[PDB]
Amino acid sequence: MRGLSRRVQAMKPSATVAVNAKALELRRQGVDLVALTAGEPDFDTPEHVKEAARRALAQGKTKYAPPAGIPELREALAEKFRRENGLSVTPEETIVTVGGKQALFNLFQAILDPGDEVIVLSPYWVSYPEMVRFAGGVVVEVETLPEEGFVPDPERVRRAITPRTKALVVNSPNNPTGAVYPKEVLEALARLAVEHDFYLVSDEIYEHLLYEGEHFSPGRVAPEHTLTVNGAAKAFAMTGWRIGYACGPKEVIKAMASVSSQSTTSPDTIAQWATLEALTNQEASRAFVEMAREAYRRRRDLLLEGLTALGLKAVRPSGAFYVLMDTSPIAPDEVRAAERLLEAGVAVVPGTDFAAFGHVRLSYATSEENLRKALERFARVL
Amino acid sequence: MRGLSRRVQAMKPSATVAVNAKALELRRQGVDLVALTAGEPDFDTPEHVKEAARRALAQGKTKYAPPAGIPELREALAEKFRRENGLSVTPEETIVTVGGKQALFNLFQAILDPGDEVIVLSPYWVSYPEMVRFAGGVVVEVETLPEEGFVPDPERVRRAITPRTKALVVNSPNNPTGAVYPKEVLEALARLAVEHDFYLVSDEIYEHLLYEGEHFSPGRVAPEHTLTVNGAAKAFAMTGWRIGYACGPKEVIKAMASVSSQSTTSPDTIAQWATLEALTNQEASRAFVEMAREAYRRRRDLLLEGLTALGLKAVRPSGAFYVLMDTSPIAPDEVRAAERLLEAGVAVVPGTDFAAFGHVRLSYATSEENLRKALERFARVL
Ligand SMILES: Cc1ncc(COP(=O)(O)O)c(CN)c1O
Ligand SMILES: Cc1ncc(COP(=O)(O)O)c(CN)c1O
């Protein structure tokens, strides 16, 4: 017989991706709207990275790369995790994937048997629950509170652990909250994984878009229980290049490259060499990162001051480029609230699927002009 | 508890990929060996395609593309399947994936429930069985005979159909056999799918590397049951670019883009624009294709004549760039036979995992010099 599988029938395709398409299609309709839905830098990818790509193209580096990635990138990855994060990985405990998303997807497909539980901290990124269930696992949510700055309380987390717990997913800096969890809290979560024997999956793609505090890698504390996921996407404005990377226990990494060989073979060879440049050319990349960070910081402060002045509540973010705004003043719920905003000319992502009810997610990864323009419309809505 | 999943523990990572790494590492050791294991063109990707890429880089086309692919490529895809294959698809029934492999992987994840059977014709490509089982399906093998030119007998196929049959996988031109199935046989297989109500998955990536006969797309006969898989990899020497495409029933295509959104988001944006050029610039691409085909043809004939002279058997291929060679004269089995050849300085892929026992797979996608050099070593082994 014909027909789709149950797993695909159960799955929700990316909600953030979906709302972006809608806001983009509305502008084609000539509709004047300010989109605050983007989850990607407005800056183009730095020139040094583009040159590395042109150089690869010219050198004929267009053939298949190994499932785990070109050796050269793996060595630079080992160096980056070591130098920037304190992790003691070897190139063999490193892997390159089609974006950080495929690092996570291949991760779950490699460690989840049907029924295995995965603890997810809410508000969580739209994709965690979907990937966990597509692999057959069960999502166990542990709540994070705004009054606690959206930082996890390791005690609420311990109370959600069961004999079925296979993994715990931490994301700092956080999407959609923008929170940066303290070293102490991360060490605590890392200890729970060691004590109870399960995997800590640390999603660090926003590590460089930090404005206050410091970035701590739990993998320093629990090295054989931790899988660190990262990527070139946010740090270098390389979202469309599709290059992510991860490190951790050699056996899990080796399992992940196996899934890669039977699905995508390996990521784009040109994009791989381009990324090698972003990582090794420290002077040039550090320069881009410093420049983008200060621009985002400047946009964060601008946005937050405006919300405060309009009497809209929002926990002050310390990383990433998102803000969860309490929509109570606008409507009784995020869906109706997001509808009103769209009608006022501003597109936001409702917090429904992030489990951030009563809130809406804003992105300050656009021009100051757009931010100011959005703030005016918020005003009239109120 | 910690531990890998049972599905990943059951899976065999790509065998062809593995033997290539070994032959490549041996040459680094300074070992003098001729590798006939490659499954990729020796030609670099044509200039027009590289230019389209440079133009995209320069225009800042580095952001996320939609899960199904940039609209422009989908429209050109609809035009290609229509113009080149006789398929009546629309852009909405088209999808771009990270290589043809992800088209197939996402396919099976979207239509296979545990226990669903998928008929696979042997010798089959190493990855079909692995992908089928990773999604929970069961592989039902239907044998193809050398004495019948490795062309499937639709009657043996009908006798393998059961109430559990969800799909049938056809691959023409074929890897590893190089056989090109006749229009009649393809129409017959397409009818079985309609009659018994199941999916026909037609893997056509080698459509342009055809030396004798014509390429028929079964999707013309059973359009609502067929999923045509293809890619830029073989036709344009774009293996490392990771761009594949497929068309078929809108609901299945839409399910495939959903899996993409929760795994890789979308393929490389730069590689997508590069591919748009390969498809629309017909004069330039047609020129590359004609040139490469005649070079492969010239290498096929060279290889085959040499085998014939050494008294080694092999069915004469009409497409792709592989040849299944009967290794009886060399050893009692492909594994021992592949071992002897390696020591004689020639690396081949044993037919074990292709279910082509007693055979070894050779690739004539290298210089005439390499082919001649390999033929000398075959001589001394005998
Ligand atoms: C929290 C989080 N983790 C992982 C990713 C993966 O990103 P990509 O596929 O673009 O690397 C994203 C995308 N922004 C993200 O927001
Ligand atoms: C029979 C067959 N089908 C599909 C593919 C997919 O190729 P790719 O991922 O490089 O597009 C290949 C690779 N050569 C193949 O041999």
DSSP string, B191-252: HHHHHTT-EEEEE-TTTT-B-SS----GGGT-TTTEEEEEESTTTTT-GGG--EEEE--HHH
Residues facing A96 on adjacent strands: A245
Write out the DSSP string of A125-152: -THHHHHHHHTT-EEEEEE--GGGTT--
Chain A: residue whose CA lies nearest to B236: A62
Element (H, E) at B300: helix B282-310
Element (H, E) at A362: strand A359-363
Chain centroid to Cα A53, Å, comes to: 25
Say which DSSP state A196 is in: T
Topology of domain B63-281, CATH:
Aspartate Aminotransferase; domain 2 (3.40.640)
Any idea what the Cα angle at residue B262 is, between residues B260 and B268, rounded to 5°?
A: 50
Shortest CA distance to B237 belongs to which of B189, B273, B289?
A: B289
- The answer to whether the annotation marks A39 as part of a ligand binding site is yes
User: Is the C-alpha dihedral spanning B105, B107, B113, B117 positive or negative?
Assistant: negative
**Coil, helix or strand at residue B28:** helix
Shortest CA distance to A150 belongs to which of A300, A28, A315, A348?
A: A315
Crossing angle of the two packed helices A47-58 and B47-58, in degrees rounded to 10: 180
**Coil, helix or strand at residue B83:** helix
Shortest CA distance to A243 belongs to which of B177, B64, B224, B277?
A: B64
Separation CA B227–CA B84 (nearest Å): 16
User: Is the C-alpha dihedral spanning B76, B79, B83, B85 positive or negative?
Assistant: positive
Backbone angles phi, psi at B347, to 5 degrees: -95, 120
Chain A: residue whose CA lies nearest to B64: A240
Separation CA B240–CA A245 (nearest Å): 18
- Does A269 contact chain B (CB < 8 Å)? yes
- The answer to whether the annotation marks A273 as part of a ligand binding site is no
**Is the bond leading into B249 cis (omega within 30 degrees of zero)?**
no
Write out the DSSP string of A158-195: HTT--TTEEEEEEESS-TTT-----HHHHHHHHHHHHH
Q: What is the resolution of this structure in A?
A: 2.6
* Amino acid letter for position A319: G
The string over A31-61, giving b where at least 16 C-beta atoms fall within 10 Å of a residue's C-beta and e elsewhere, is eebbbbbbbbbbbbbbebbbebbbebbeeeb
Backbone angles phi, psi at B275, to 5 degrees: -65, -35
Separation CA B232–CA B234 (nearest Å): 6
Distances from the Cα of B157 to the Cαs of A149, B24, B150, in angstroms?
62, 39, 13
Residue of the CA atom closest to atom 16 of ligand 1? A175
Nearest to A4 among B110, B130, B237 (CB): B110
DSSP H stretches of helix in chain A: 6-10, 15-28, 47-58, 71-85, 99-111, 127-134, 154-158, 183-195, 250-261, 269-280, 282-310, 334-343, 368-381
User: Is the C-alpha dihedral spanning A139, A140, A142, A146 positive or negative?
Assistant: positive
**Discontinuities after residues in chain A (C–N over 2.5 A):** none
Backbone angles phi, psi at A257, to 5 degrees: -70, -20
Separation CA B99–CA B136 (nearest Å): 22
Q: Measured between beta carbons, which residues in chain A are less than 8 angstroms from residue B263?
A: 101-102, 105, 131
* Amino acid letter for position B111: I
**Coil, helix or strand at residue B171:** strand
The set of residues, in sequence order, having a beta carbon less than 8 Å from that of B149 and lying 6+ positions away, is B179, B315
- Does B85 contact chain A (CB < 8 Å)? no
* Amino acid letter for position A261: S
Contact A203, A162 (CB under 8 A): no
Shortest CA distance to B330 belongs to which of B355, B310, B349?
A: B310
Shortest CA distance to B5 belongs to which of A199, A66, A156?
A: A199
Strands B244-247 and B349-350: unpaired
Q: CB-side exposure of B215: number of CA atoms within 13 Å?
A: 24
Q: Which of A45, A96, A101 to mutate to test the pocket of ligand 1 (most atoms within 8 A of CB)?
A: A101
Crossing angle of the two packed helices B250-261 and B99-111, in degrees rounded to 10: 110
What distance in angstroms lies between residue B101's CA and the mean position of ligand 2's atoms?
6
> Do B242 and A44 make contact, defined as CB atoms within 8 angstroms?
no
Shortest CA distance to A93 belongs to which of A106, A109, A77, A80?
A: A77
Q: Which class in CATH covers the domain with range B1-62+282-381?
A: alpha beta
Ligand nearest to the CA of A241: 1
CB pairs under 8 A between A and B: 220
The closest-lying atom of ligand 1 relative to the alpha carbon of residue A234 is 14
- Does A105 contact chain B (CB < 8 Å)? yes
Shortest CA distance to A356 belongs to which of A144, A151, A154?
A: A144
Contact B179, B172 (CB under 8 A): yes
Separation CA B360–CA B40 (nearest Å): 17
Q: Measured between beta carbons, which residues in chain B are less than 8 angstroms from residue A259?
A: 8, 11, 134
Domain boundaries, chain A: 1-62+282-381, 63-281
The interface residues of chain A toward chain B in range 190-249, judged by CB-CB distance below 8 A, are: 197-199, 225, 237-242
Contact A245, A94 (CB under 8 A): yes
**Coil, helix or strand at residue B165:** strand
Distances from the Cα of B222 to the Cαs of A148, B86, B377, in angstroms?
59, 12, 47
Distances from the Cα of B54 to the Cαs of A79, B48, B140, B157, B352, in angstroms?
30, 10, 46, 48, 42
**Coil, helix or strand at residue B296:** helix
| Residue A39 in contact with ligand 1 by CB distance below 6 A | yes
Contact A319, A172 (CB under 8 A): yes
Token code pair at residue B341? 């050849």
| Residue A233 in contact with ligand 1 by CB distance below 6 A | yes
Going through chain B in order, the beta strands assigned E by DSSP cover: 34-35, 94-97, 117-122, 138-143, 165-171, 199-203, 226-231, 244-247, 322-326, 346-347, 349-350, 359-363
Chain centroid to Cα A334, Å, comes to: 22
> Do B262 and A7 make contact, defined as CB atoms within 8 angstroms?
no
State the burial class of residue B54 (Cβ atoms within 10 Å of its Cβ: 0-12, 13-18, 19+): middle
> Do A113 and B237 make contact, defined as CB atoms within 8 angstroms?
no
The set of residues, in sequence order, having a beta carbon less than 8 Å from that of B351 and lying 6+ positions away, is B123, B176, B324, B334, B357, B358, B359, B360, B361
Contact B37, B378 (CB under 8 A): no
